[PDB]
Amino acid sequence: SSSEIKIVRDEYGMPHIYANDTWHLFYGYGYVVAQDRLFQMEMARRSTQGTVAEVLGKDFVKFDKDIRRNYWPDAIRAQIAALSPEDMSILQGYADGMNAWIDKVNTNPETLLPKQFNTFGFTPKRWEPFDVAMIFVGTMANRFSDSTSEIDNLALLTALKDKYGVSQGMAVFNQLKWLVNPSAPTTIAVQES
Amino acid sequence: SNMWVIGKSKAQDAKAIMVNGPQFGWYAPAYTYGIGLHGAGYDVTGNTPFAYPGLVFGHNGVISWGSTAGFGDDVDIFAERLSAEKPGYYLHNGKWVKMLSREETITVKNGQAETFTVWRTVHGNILQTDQTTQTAYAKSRAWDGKEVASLLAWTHQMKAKNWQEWTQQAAKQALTINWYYADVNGNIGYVHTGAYPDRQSGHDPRLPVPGTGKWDWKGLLPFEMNPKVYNPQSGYIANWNNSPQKDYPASDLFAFLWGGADRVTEIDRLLEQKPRLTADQAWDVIRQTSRQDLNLRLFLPTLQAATSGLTQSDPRRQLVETLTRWDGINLLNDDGKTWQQPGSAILNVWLTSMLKRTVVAAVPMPFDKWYSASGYETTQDGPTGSLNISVGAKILYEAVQGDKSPIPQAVDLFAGKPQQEVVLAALEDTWETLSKRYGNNVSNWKTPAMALTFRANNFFGVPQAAAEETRHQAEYQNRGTENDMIVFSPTTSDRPVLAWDVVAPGQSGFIAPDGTVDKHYEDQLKMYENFGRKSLWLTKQDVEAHKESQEVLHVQR
């Protein structure tokens, strides 16, 4: 069947999802993630959207403000809205899968609720496609592809010019923060390109 | 993050071998999540960070893929021109343009709420403003508006069956990331993926540009421009966040450089060493590189030359002889807390002293603090990520190369003194410092080993577990957060593919309300520490053969 989602766990607990369509396949994935890593995922959702002070307090206000100032939520929603129904299924399947398991947990918290929700004094909320997308955006795009120190570099360069004068300040800048160095060991050999 | 890919011509008893060690820090519960997907055109196995829809590490029985951080320059800062009167406007192409703005309310558990505004221009969100210059800085990313497409390219690539299909997906991944390929036929490939700006002529990407119009990027460079290799003449592909290719410019980070001193050399040495490598040998490179001091190789010749005319009773000469006798591989003593040889401690003190006398001296305060680290960092919990050669150390290496270095020495870092005299002065400092703490008998120096901590707070510094959930490993290992190996066409099996991984502490982070920990909460922790690994299953018969449980759902959209 098309309604059927079979979940097989191996000797390490690693889940394997058997499904006939995209929505059912990502629903299965979403479901096991909510089983295995709900507190982690929940904290990862608040970290990537800047909503930690709500449950954790005063100490995270600066963190929350810094996260919100580094993205444009509306630009992310517009990319979601432009997806094709097959692409959209991935994200919707996933959020739906998670929600299915959050509903049972929230229904039977005396045995299903992750101990840390009790510790931290809050409970899990339902997910939407925007939340799934933000997990990737916040931990892959901001943590590994958002690197610059240009303002700082300018500050440094300005200090080298008041020390060595204008032309000298610039040549020292090139010695400390060169653009390229032809002796750098490379992944692609020079014969290749 | 490191990777080594071995093709047909370098592989022994297989056609292709892929070993990946993504480095993201050590966390409890595991940074990555193990998952197999079978249906809707997908047939994959692997693990991926934060259980993203697409698997960063894994294979589909035909091809295998992996990644390492790219570090290309894909972000530039635009100095936006503001008017004192007419606020929330900026000058662009001779018109006063209005900024996008949004208000935000930060709700605070047990405190008052807080609201602020976020501003944005054509170039990007505003970082900071200088109302004295009447300048606002906007951070411009080449991948702005392709975030979602990058996620989907990472998902769709799992279905590729060849290089041709695989690169159609690589062309849509817009973040600066290295992608790797291997297949059942022994083919191997590499692509430095990402969206890079087509800059205006005379744009120096290390420094801000005016955002008034003339400095605006021309667009984005085509994918034909992205560094890539297929079936390289060497038989292998190695990367440890080094330069992709000759003359490729790195990130603008002051602290990031691609120079003659690079930790990828440590991988290359080992792969060129043996004409062919087996899977056990390819796996074994993790153990060696985990334990290798990264500075020994770079400065041993320099220290040797400087102490050559010194006497045997000279302590500065003794210290160099200790290092000469050493292979650079750190091993713990029986005590589980100290290293067998004092090499790293010596290089650490020497290097700190050397930096203070050379690079630090040439830079004005407080910029001098950026170049003073030796790269031996750590605290009690050990390093937060990988060990690397510090920026100051890469700059000092070029200086000690003298004229063999391609980098013009605008200021002589040795400030008119012969090299040997600065080296010997730092060696005197070293001896004075270390002998004071450990005594005069170098042979009984029991130096402190670095440790490994699986942190309860995620990389943002936000709790993702209870503090008590923190795990400790005695030996610091400069390796992936996870390690995975894929072997295509083993001669050793009937199986066309064999794959292994390790996801520590375990698959599950579940703790029941009563304090009852899941069965798979920490069953991979000891395996991690002793360089072990678990089989990854793809086919139904393997999965069936190894099943521990089954759950069937009947759901309709």
Ligand SMILES: O=C(O)Cc1ccccc1
């Ligand atoms: O190299 C890194 O810092 C970690 C990493 C691995 C794979 C992809 C992105 C980042």
Ligand SMILES: [Ca+2]
């Ligand atoms: Ca830049």
